[PDB]
Write a protein that binds this ligand. Structure first.
Ligand SMILES: CNC(=O)[C@H](Cc1c[nH]c2ccccc12)NC(=O)[C@@H](CC(=O)NO)CC(C)C
Ligand SMILES: [Zn+2]
Length: 747
């Protein structure tokens, strides 16, 4: 009866009968007709100012449809056969003041033909009058249309298509759907009708199963999100929602201190480095070294950082002028492009000091592991104080008596999730369309997400920045804690859990975006999934490599918004790895690793924050962050997913490159089993690098190990051509490596 109530409330509100004889049997008859339509499509019609009129005799003879034009007075039935309006039993008047007219009859229980037509007209209202206001149907329903057209049995077409669509060769492109607006809306109406009229439902499932499934899933679940999105379009609706939430947090807001307000503020605007401070905290000796070191010569500083640094030299220019040029004039050419040890150390210490104070970034980088010793102790503690405090400020949950389900919105840049994919998300030709191919890949294994920092969301959806093609629709839990912001936003507590309920391409303001429907759940529920996954992937590969049953080789250090993908991609990476390297080369090397308690860490927090690396660092500034990294001391391969390595097709290439470094380790172990050195450091190799140390990837031209690793990787790619490349361009190395693989396999 939870449903029953909702009906009459709305029905007697939008539905008005006007008959002759006893209006008890006639009303209860027409009511039996509407009760079969999804409760929500009735409320969406109310929203756009629609009303339903049940009358006797000719329908054209009614107040509303009175001002109707003579021309259109010729509508076709569900089967597309003309029939004049003053002779029909239904009609849905379009326009910005929607009206629905139906003749009185109870035989609808028998005459399924009329009922099917009434629902047809209604479906027409849903697609043409309602959903169009929120750019629907779109790609999803479009896919159904194509599944239906190219399918084997062509009956599904004869059932829902018109000869207009029946003749179109190629699939229906997004553009098609745009210029053929009414056509698509038509199919929707017909599918809706057949699915709603109890008697024709089977015919739909028989000839057009995909269409049945779509309307089935739409009418049961997804219909409510449509209502929600339609409401989001309405002024009074948006401000009524914002006000209840504001009211709910009024006490909390009214008690916020100035200190509190200040904390929330810097959470929104990071503090940038003060050029002044920088210099001062240098050193009488150091300042000397910075006056002319070239920041452009570094390979560990982002241009972003470089630009800033060089602007510090320029600000030291004071006394004894002559110096200025003797330095500018004595360092540029005869000194050259190359490098310098002692001073690069200086730049690595400065990198740390010139990072902006960004609380959210810190949580994201560390996955919430705020004690990570990846930055100087002084700032680490400052971050910990502000964080602990923010956790205490956002204590009140969203649950209220003023409302039930509540959706909050977040616009996001895809690079923040997967840079490697964000490179081709947008269509290169037309920047307003989404590359369907990347879409499917991105969507692939995206089942759950994690928030380790403080998410900032909008109460009502708002337009995104140019580089934000991701639009999240999140259903909060009444348990979720948050803070209210005057500008119509909420700051959510850290360590939230998110299940991905749906992912689809949607149009808005002439551009396409990726709508992500998510539901907030306990972070423990997601973590448990990750942990069961780790257990699974280890049993599986322990068996494939012949390792003791309970060894801990593979580890998931997952804490961010693309969580599920890090886990699932790990399986795929390890596969390209075995199917591209000598099964016996793997075993000896990983066995060696396991002996040293090594690990294969797949993570989404920055590498400087993985213990497998930081616990073996002499100095903090010596840390390294990148796509992949091999650590000899811990004997582990670290792979950071979110990133995009310097032109390396995928994560696999990256993982393999690191395994290369591992080989250079074991092989180097076999030579001087009495010492700890790399076979890549051997003289016999130093020379080869002096000759072929340029015949490969620009990167390989960095140094010994790097060269060996890149060569190794190529020699194992999936594109066999790349294997030959080293063959015909780095012969010396090719052999050296293949000798190395034997010198391990056999020993
Ligand atoms: C964004 N990912 C990248 O392309 C960075 C770039 C980089 C080089 N040196 C650095 C020092 C500090 C921070 C970043 C870098 N490099 C890497 O990931 C390389 C890491 C490596 O050589 N591991 O053994 C693997 C290589 C095949 C891409
Ligand atoms: Zn390397």
């Amino acid at each position: 009866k939870t449903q029953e109530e909702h009906l009459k409330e709305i029905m007697k509100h939008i539905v008005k009968i006007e008959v002759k004889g006893e209006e008890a049997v006639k009303k209860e008859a027409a009511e039996k007709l509407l009760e079969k339509v999804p409760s929500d499509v009735l409320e969406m019609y109310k929203a756009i100012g629609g009303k339903i009129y049940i009358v006797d005799g000719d329908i054209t003879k009614h107040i509303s449809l009175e001002a109707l034009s003579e021309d259109k007075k010729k509508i076709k039935d569900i089967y597309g056969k003309d029939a004049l309006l003053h002779e029909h039993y239904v009609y849905a008047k379009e326009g910005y003041e929607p009206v629905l007219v139906i003749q009185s009859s109870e035989d609808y229980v028998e005459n399924t033909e009329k009922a099917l037509n009434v629902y047809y007209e209604i479906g027409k209202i849903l697609s043409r009058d309602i959903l169009s206001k929120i750019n629907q149907p779109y790609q999803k329903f479009l896919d159904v249309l194509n599944t239906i057209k190219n399918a084997s049995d062509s009956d599904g077409q004869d059932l829902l298509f018109t000869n207009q669509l029946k003749e179109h060769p190629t699939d229906f492109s997004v553009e098609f759907l745009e210029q053929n607006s009414n056509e698509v809306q038509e199919v929707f109406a017909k599918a809706f009708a057949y699915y709603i009229e109890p008697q024709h439902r089977d015919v739909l499932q028989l000839y057009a199963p995909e269409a049945f499934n779509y309307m089935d899933k739409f009418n049961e679940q997804e219909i409510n999100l449509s209502l929600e999105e339609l409401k989001d379009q309405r002024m009074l609706s948006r401000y009524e929602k914002w006000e209840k939430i504001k009211q709910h947090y009024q006490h909390w807001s009214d008690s916020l201190s100035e200190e509190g307000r200040g904390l929330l503020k810097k959470l929104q605007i990071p503090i940038e480095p003060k050029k002044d401070d920088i210099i001062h905290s240098l050193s009488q000796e150091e300042k000397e070294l910075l006056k002319r070191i070239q920041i452009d010569s570094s390979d560990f500083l982002s241009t972003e950082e470089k630009e800033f640094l060089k602007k510090l030299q320029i600000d030291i220019r004071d006394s004894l002028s002559e110096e200025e040029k003797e330095l500018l004039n004595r360092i540029q050419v005869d000194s050259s492009n190359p490098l310098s040890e002692k001073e690069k150390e200086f730049l690595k210490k400065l990198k740390l000091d010139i990072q902006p104070y960004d609380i959210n970034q810190r949580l994201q980088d560390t996955g919430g592991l705020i004690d990570s010793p990846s930055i100087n102790l002084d700032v680490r503690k400052q971050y910990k104080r502000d964080i602990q405090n923010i956790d205490a400020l956002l204590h009140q949950s969203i649950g209220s008596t003023l409302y039930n389900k509540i959706y909050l919105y977040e616009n996001m840049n895809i690079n923040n999730l997967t840079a490697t994919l964000g490179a081709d998300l947008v269509d290169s030709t037309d920047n307003t369309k989404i590359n369907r191919g990347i879409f499917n890949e991105f969507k692939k294994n995206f089942k759950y997400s994690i928030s380790s920092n403080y998410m900032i969301v909008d109460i009502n959806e708002r337009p995104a920045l140019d580089n934000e093609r991701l639009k999240w629709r999140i259903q909060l839990s009444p348990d979720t804690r948050a803070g209210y912001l005057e500008n119509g936003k909420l700051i959510l507590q850290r360590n939230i859990g998110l299940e991905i309920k749906d992912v689809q391409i949607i149009k808005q303001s002439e551009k396409e975006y990726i709508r992500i429907d998510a539901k907030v759940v306990p972070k423990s529920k997601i973590d448990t999934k990750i942990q069961e996954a780790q257990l699974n992937i280890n049993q599986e590969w322990n068996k494939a490599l012949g390792l003791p049953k309970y060894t801990k080789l593979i580890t998931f250090n997952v804490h961010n918004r693309y969580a599920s993908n890090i886990v699932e991609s790990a399986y795929l990476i390890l596969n390209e790895w075995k199917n591209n390297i000598q099964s016996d080369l793997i075993k000896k090397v990983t066995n060696y690793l396991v002996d040293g308690n090594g690990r294969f860490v797949f993570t989404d927090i920055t590498l400087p924050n993985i213990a497998e690396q930081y616990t073996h660092q002499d100095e903090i500034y010596e840390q390294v962050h990148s796509k992949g990294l091999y650590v000899p001391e811990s004997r582990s391969i670290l792979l950071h997913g979110p990133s995009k390595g310097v032109e390396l097709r995928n994560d696999s290439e990256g993982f393999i490159h690191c395994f290369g470094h591992a080989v250079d380790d074991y092989a180097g172990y076999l030579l001087d089993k009495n010492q700890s050195d790399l076979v890549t450091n051997s003289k016999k190799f130093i020379d080869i690098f002096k000759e072929e140390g340029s015949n490969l990837t620009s990167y390989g031209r960095t140094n010994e190990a790097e060269f060996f690793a890149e060569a190794f990787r190529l020699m194992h790619s999936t594109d066999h051509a790349e294997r030959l490349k080293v063959q015909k361009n780095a012969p010396k190395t090719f052999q050296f490596i293949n000798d190395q693989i034997k010198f391990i396999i056999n020993s």
